Amino acid sequence: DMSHKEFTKFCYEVYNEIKISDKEFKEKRAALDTLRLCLKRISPDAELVAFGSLESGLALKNSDMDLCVLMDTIALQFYEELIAEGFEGKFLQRARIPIIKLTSDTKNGFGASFQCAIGFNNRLAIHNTLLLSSYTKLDARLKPMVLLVKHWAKRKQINSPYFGTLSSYGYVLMVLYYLIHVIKPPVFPNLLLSPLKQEKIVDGFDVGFDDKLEDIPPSQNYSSLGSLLHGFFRFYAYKFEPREKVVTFRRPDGYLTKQEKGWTSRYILAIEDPFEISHNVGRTVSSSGLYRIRGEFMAASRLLNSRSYPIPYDSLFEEA
Ligand SMILES: [Br-]
Ligand SMILES: [Br-]
Ligand SMILES: [Mg+2]
Ligand SMILES: [Mg+2]
CATH class of the missing domain: 1.10.1410.10 (Poly(a)-polymerase, middle domain)
Incomplete structure (x- = not known):
């Protein structure tokens, strides 16, 4: 053609x-590692899973991370630890669909413009990412x-x-x-x-x-x-x-x-x-x-x- x-x-x-550059990709990987360790301080029975464009490989430069906590109230405990850890962000307890939005990092070296959204038990988003990932590999x-x-x-x-x-x-x-x-x-x-x-x-x-x-x-x-x-x-x-x-x-x-x-x-x-x-x-x-x-x-x-x-x-x- x-x-x-x-x-x-x-x-x-x-x-x-x-x-997205390989450098920015590696950075968001390290952020995910750091957040996973923070979650394991709250519960051994919760896992932190990345989904969306960073996971599928369909990310533009400067994209936000999309993460989901899978289990089975942990949301509030996780939120409190994250801010104690020096992340800054927002959270509405009891919300229809709880979401932690991290808007900055002050201690962990991920930048003043670190943006990350953390949802809870969103298994469907994980599966549509799996599907999108497969097509990108195809x-x-x-x-x-x-x-x-x-x-x-x-x-x-x-x-x-x-x-x-x-x-x-x-x-x-x-x-x-x-x-x-x-x-x-x-x-x-x-x-x-x-x-x-x-x-x-x-x-x-x-x-x-x-x-x-x-x-x-x-x-x-x-x-x-x-x-x-x-x-x-x-x-x-x-x-x-x-x-x-x-x-x-x-x-x-x-x-x-x-x-x-x-x-x-x-x-x-x-x-x-x-x-x-x-x-x-x-x-x-x-x-x-x-x-x-x-x-x-x-x-x-x-x-x-x-x-x-x-x-x-x-x-x-x-x-x-
Ligand atoms: Br046409
Ligand atoms: Br997408
Ligand atoms: Mg060509
Ligand atoms: Mg045009």
């Missing part, structure tokens, strides 16, 4: 600038594609779940959906729908998937990174119908209506979590938020569709 050679070269240049093109889409969403201000747009995880799912169920030949098989997948029930949901990666043959898609991204932008700009359809990993042909799903009355953008199927990852998206997201997909597509010469690829990541 030599169709997008220039754009591809540019994609890999930006990727190398935005990906195809070398996935990691840069995800980072570039995340970087784009951030720069275009459409990566703000608290402000009516979409979480980073939401964009990752939109990427996987495209690579599995839209692009032909597929970049990836659907690991949940594999005939080798076995059911595994956690928290009332099936988190089973075909995880024996060595038995998965290499992709029959030979598209360059640039071609994959252009295709992804065009699908969500022009083809996907968010008023009617659900991004899903539970259908062999990837086809699912909001009607059938019963997601009709927030469901402005519908993205069904692959394990917690009752959760719409896009429920933070407002009507105005979706209009801006769609607008940005069209602009990205328009830029890349250009038959003119030298294309200003930089504008893809220029702010606003």
Whole structure:
């Protein structure tokens, strides 16, 4: 595939600038080690598990850590020890879903800008990280594609779940959906729908998937990174119908209506979590938020569709 050679070269240049460094990666590893030791002072029966982009390898520079304490009230004891240990942070006891947010470190050398969120017994988040991790190990093109889409969403201000747009995880799912169920030949098989997948029930949901990666043959898609991204932008700009359809990993042909799903009355953008199927990852998206997201997909597509010469690829990541 030599169709997008220039754009591809540019994609890999930006990727190398935005990906987390091995140094920052090692630092967050040491932070995790330190926090684990702190938790073991509270209880021998609790474990501290990393999830999210640092664990899957899909992290941008300066990303926050996402951690989960697994057990079986420890939250408050852990919080008190962490601050006694010189971390600074926030915690709301008895909260619906307790969360410790660490915002700084004063004694442990992890920096004044050390950011870490610690949840409790969130086994589902751990399993979707396992799934994302497997896909990143399956195809070398996935990691840069995800980072570039995340970087784009951030720069275009459409990566703000608290402000009516979409979480980073939401964009990752939109990427996987495209690579599995839209692009032909597929970049990836659907690991949940594999005939080798076995059911595994956690928290009332099936988190089973075909995880024996060595038995998965290499992709029959030979598209360059640039071609994959252009295709992804065009699908969500022009083809996907968010008023009617659900991004899903539970259908062999990837086809699912909001009607059938019963997601009709927030469901402005519908993205069904692959394990917690009752959760719409896009429920933070407002009507105005979706209009801006769609607008940005069209602009990205328009830029890349250009038959003119030298294309200003930089504008893809220029702010606003
Ligand atoms: Br993610
Ligand atoms: Br199209
Ligand atoms: Mg290449
Ligand atoms: Mg643009």
